[PDB]
Amino acid sequence: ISGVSPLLYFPPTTTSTTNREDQINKNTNIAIQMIKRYKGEVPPHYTRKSSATIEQVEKEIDALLGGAEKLRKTSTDDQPMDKLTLMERCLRHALWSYHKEEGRYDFDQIGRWVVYTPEDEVKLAQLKREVEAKEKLAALRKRREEEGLPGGPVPRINWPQEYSSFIDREPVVAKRIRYDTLASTTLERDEKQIES
């Protein structure tokens, strides 16, 4: 850092008023645009042949499988299956696939009625970590917001050391500008519109 610099570094805060709502709105709009491009086109509309709710279908399935409980007999995994077992597996597989696509991530039943392949197990484990990670991130981002700490991530840096290390201030000042700007922005989107 040899050489008397012409100016003392100050925070690049110049947009004193930058409402969090506007930033998250822009993040949502960009997120929606990218999602639309990645997916492509909304698939062509389909008209249902019959009208029925998912809850009604689940209730009907439970009623159908409840009357055969006495007849239903368990057996070893390697042994041949029964008609009741096959029907139960198919129905529950379809039901839980629909639920997971919808958003009802109940891993306890999904791991039972949908896992039949090692690749399926890997996909489930990958999904299980992701959902928990998002839940933890949202909780702490909310608990961080309540405290008042900056929303964006902050690197573990000691700029007094960086100034001594580097010879020219230009790269060091640029790095501070980027991180200071990053720490002053909320990298969050509106997950209601995204889910919609």
């Binding site: 484990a125 990958q126 970590r129 933890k136 909780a139 702490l140 608990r143």
Partner: protein, 94 residues
């Protein structure tokens, strides 16, 4: 590391000097573990005091548990790179 120095000191005392550490020595170790935030070493020292000594200062046991549950909330229960999924050819052997 303060914990490493004290444990080595105890090792010297018990093995190379034939002196049994008392309750006071272990309490100091537990205090250091609580102070430093190392909540996994506290569990091990807690059992040591419950095994050789008579229990642990219940003040320190509770403090360690508080530190552990803070990590669970903040997610620092284990170093993150360990949790990253890997593969046979996805591991960088330095």
């Amino acid at each position: 590391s303060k914990f490493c120095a004290m444990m080595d000191l105890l090792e010297e005392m018990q093995h190379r000097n034939r002196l049994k550490p008392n309750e006071e020595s272990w309490t100091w170790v537990m205090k250091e573990c609580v102070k430093s935030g190392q909540f996994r070493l506290g569990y091990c020292i807690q059992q040591v005091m419950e095994t050789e000594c008579k229990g642990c200062p219940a003040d320190l046991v509770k403090a360690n548990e508080a530190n552990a549950q803070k990590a669970k909330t903040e997610g620092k229960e284990h170093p993150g790179h360990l949790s990253q999924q890997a593969g046979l050819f996805d591991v960088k052997v330095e």
